[PDB]
Design a protein around this ligand. Structure first.
Ligand SMILES: O=C1c2ccccc2C2=C(c3nc4ccncc4[nH]3)CCCN12
Ligand SMILES: Cc1onc(-c2ccc(O)cc2O)c1-c1ccccc1
Length: 207
């Protein structure tokens, strides 16, 4: 396990998302499904030039998996996935410019719900999660686990868990007062409201 320090801008945004009072927390699911959708679009488009890019799996889908016992909501997609370079370096650059733009837009009067327009919608996960684990597999790299409970650091390690083939699994370790996001009726309500037109099958698993 390797430990990394978040740069100042993202660290400040993560603290804002965790601290600030905001009742409309359900938007996290739309943002994570949007990232999954974007990742799926990416592998699909690349497969048009190189069909062997789907040898790691032809299915293009999104699964929502609540687990009341573990107090986790897991989002699984078979998108392009992220390499080690993406997790540590590339997305760190994106986190900085996206945070700066978002903070500038907020200061003018923009709302937290507009986060995805700045490319940092992933961070809305901290509205409901005390810890986020990202297990990802890109065709050009090994399976990795990125994780952060905020507090200024994140970890990256090669993942030894169940092989994913290709894609990303985001495990949301929910805050104690955010268990409504494990209820079938609640998840169904959110997907219908914000993600009804996503171009991939969204399967809501039940327990
Ligand atoms: O979806 C997104 C996303 C979307 C936008 C920006 C970052 C991310 C992002 C990650 C990330 N790597 C980082 C390394 C250093 N500073 C911050 C970082 N943020 C890793 C997990 C997934 N992720
Ligand atoms: C590429 C890529 O490959 N997997 C993800 C991913 C990141 C987060 C997530 O919740 C689900 C995902 O599939 C992304 C991605 C990164 C930044 C913005 C949008 C998508």
């Amino acid at each position: 396990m390797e430990t990394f320090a978040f740069q100042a801008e993202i660290a400040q945004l993560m603290s804002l998302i965790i601290n600030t009072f905001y009742s409309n927390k359900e938007i996290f699911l739309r943002e994570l499904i949007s990232n999954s959708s974007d990742a799926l679009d990416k592998i699909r488009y690349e497969s048009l030039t190189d069909p062997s890019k789907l040898d790691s799996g032809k299915e293009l889908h999104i699964n929502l998996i609540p687990n009341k016992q573990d107090r986790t909501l897991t989002i699984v997609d078979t998108g392009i996935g992220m390499t080690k370079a993406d997790l540590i370096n590339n997305l760190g650059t994106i986190a900085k410019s996206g945070t700066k733009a978002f903070m500038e837009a907020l200061q003018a009067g923009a709302d937290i719900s507009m986060i995805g327009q700045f490319g940092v919608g992933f961070y809305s996960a901290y509205l409901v999660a005390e810890k986020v684990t990202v297990i990802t597999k890109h065709n050009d790299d090994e399976q990795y686990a990125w994780e952060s409970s905020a507090g200024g650091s994140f970890t990256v390690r090669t993942d030894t868990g169940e092989p994913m083939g290709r894609g990303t699994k985001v495990i949301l370790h929910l805050k104690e007062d955010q268990t409504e996001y494990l209820e079938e009726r609640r998840i169904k309500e959110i997907v219908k409201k914000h993600s009804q037109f996503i171009g991939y099958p969204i399967t809501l698993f039940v327990e």
